[PDB]
């Protein structure tokens, strides 16, 4: 069992098709490339978080295309004297050249060709130079395609990304819910799965689960089932009766440690406009700013305009700014990236694995995309401020890259941000509305049963000028009271719904998050700026 086709992968239709074309056209039909009269592309750099299926995908494409497949590791060939490694590399390239068509899979290229700033040993520079010379020396007629894999795309010598080298980059992010379901189906094609299963529920619950983690979860569930069935002990009645159960999957979920979320990565979004509580004027203003240009580029080009790539939000905390940003990213079918506090503060201190350049380059590669920076004032240090300023000034013409920032203290942040060519667009978050609060409560209570047609108007009219977080805190307090009452009744679900007493108790205990003086100051500042 060492052969796998495209059917053995899931959740990467876009990347799978990209690799398929970019590595089959130069091999299967090189004639058309010369018919147009161009040099077919050679380098292909696929990168992603560890355990996302890079090696498996490369092996699958190589085996399915039926092409000569010379495989080179990373540290294996790197740990040796300069003569030996060069010998190894030259032999690999010569063998690939001699027996065309050939594909070379230089795995873990990062170790071979790291960045010169921190690792400047002459061995690394010599190896990189020979690799570049060999890469440029490949004959156009020869059908050789080089594929490299790495986990930190910005942690390699930039020279390898120039034309005539690993130019075409591919990013393999976390699989989505559909991707997770596909992976689960692929892995669970041999287990004696029981009739009762919730694969869709498992996909919904599993967030930030790379393929490796999903396989580990399936194996753990099978082991748990075996352990449960080991008590009865071989009888064929035991063998046939063996079968995994949804409870096993839940236990495995409870006993696993996903690691994709550790570092900043690209994630999809699905939020929608209706998820917000209203404020249609701000929605339309933001649409004019960000989305309409993408849908009306011809009008802007005719009259003459460029998209204003950047908007800064300010106002009371916990007002749904993140929900608005996710909705905006969803409406353009673009991947979303976020950085929150420590994610950038660690780079500010330097102890981290990803730099601001890394995230910006990932956003560019996965364009179109929206990058959101929370508590942007948390850094207002000088180095990170300068780097952000330079990156923002380095905005592309029509790449649709957008940056959004969250901060309730615009004055403290460096005024350098609010200048032409930067986040000159300022948006204030107003107070929530009664209808907005009622809609938020209903949305948060989609699954929790309550009184049919429960009277929330009294609470809505009692909660005037309260922040969004107050509604959620009140809901949680009422839910805790209801659970306590149900537990007391059972020990001493006859009342699945909840009456007004829980909400009244929460209101008595509940207090506003935004202070009256602070709210007044924010409103006065907003009005002064508007004037």
């Amino acid at each position: 069992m060492n052969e796998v086709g495209y059917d053995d992968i899931g959740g990467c239709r876009k990347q799978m098709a990209q690799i398929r074309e970019m590595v089959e056209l130069p091999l299967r039909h090189p004639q058309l490339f010369k018919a147009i009269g161009i040099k077919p592309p050679r380098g292909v750099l696929m990168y992603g978080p560890p355990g996302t299926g890079k090696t498996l995908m490369a092996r699958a494409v190589a085996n399915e295309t039926g092409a000569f497949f010379f495989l080179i590791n990373g540290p294996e060939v790197m740990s040796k004297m300069a003569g030996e490694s060069e010998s190894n590399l030259r032999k690999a390239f010569e063998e690939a050249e001699k027996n065309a068509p050939a594909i070379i899979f230089i795995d873990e290229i990062d170790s071979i060709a790291p960045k010169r700033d921190k690792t400047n040993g002459e061995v690394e520079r010599r190896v990189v130079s020979q690799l570049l010379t060999l890469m440029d020396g490949m004959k156009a007629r020869s059908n050789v395609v080089v594929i490299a894999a790495t986990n930190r795309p910005n942690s390699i010598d930039p020279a390898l990304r120039r034309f005539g080298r690993f130019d075409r980059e591919v990013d393999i992010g976390i699989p989505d819910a559909t991707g997770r379901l596909e992976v689960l189906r692929i892995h669970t094609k041999n287990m004696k799965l029981a009739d009762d299963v919730d694969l869709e529920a498992l996909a919904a619950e599993t967030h930030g689960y790379v393929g490796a983690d999903i396989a580990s979860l399936c194996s753990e569930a099978a082991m748990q089932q075996i352990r449960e069935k080991m008590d009865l002990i071989i009888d064929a009645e035991v063998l046939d009766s063996l079968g995994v159960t949804m409870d096993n999957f839940r236990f495995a979920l409870g006993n696993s440690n996903p690691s994709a979320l550790r570092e900043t990565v690209v994630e999809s979004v699905n939020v929608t406009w209706d998820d917000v509580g209203g404020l249609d004027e701000i929605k339309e203003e933001l649409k004019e700013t960000v989305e309409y240009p993408v849908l009306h580029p011809d009008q802007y080009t005719k009259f003459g305009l460029s998209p204003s790539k950047g908007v800064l939000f300010y106002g009371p905390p916990g007002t749904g700014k993140t929900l608005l940003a996710k909705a905006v990213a969803t409406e353009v079918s673009a991947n979303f990236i976020s950085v929150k506090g420590p994610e950038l503060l660690s780079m500010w201190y330097g102890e981290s694995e990803s730099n601001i350049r890394d995230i910006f380059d990932k956003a560019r590669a996965a364009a179109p995309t929206v990058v959101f920076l929370d508590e942007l004032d948390s850094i207002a240090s000088d180095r990170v401020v300068n780097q952000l300023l330079t990156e923002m000034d380095g905005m592309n013409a029509k790449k649709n890259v957008f940056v959004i920032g969250a901060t309730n203290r615009p004055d403290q942040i460096d005024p350098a941000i609010l200048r032409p060519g930067r986040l000159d667009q300022l948006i204030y978050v107003p107070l929530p509305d009664e209808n907005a609060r009622l809609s938020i409560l209903n949305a948060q209570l989609r699954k929790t049963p309550l009184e049919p047609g429960l009277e929330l108007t009294a609470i809505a009219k009692a909660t005037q000028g309260f922040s969004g977080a107050d509604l959620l805190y009140i809901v949680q307090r009422a839910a805790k009271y209801a659970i306590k009452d149900s537990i007391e009744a059972h020990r001493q679900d006859p009342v699945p719904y909840i009456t007004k007493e829980h909400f009244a108790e929460a209101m008595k205990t509940a207090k506003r998050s935004v202070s009256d003086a602070e709210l007044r100051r924010y409103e006065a500042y907003s009005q002064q700026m508007k004037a």
């Binding site: 052969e3 086709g5 085996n63 399915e64 039926g66």
Partner: peptide, 13 residues
């Protein structure tokens, strides 16, 4: 069939 291959179903995968 598939896998550049050409009881039969198992052989052709």
């Amino acid at each position: 069939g598939k896998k550049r291959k050409d009881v039969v179903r198992n052989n052709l995968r």
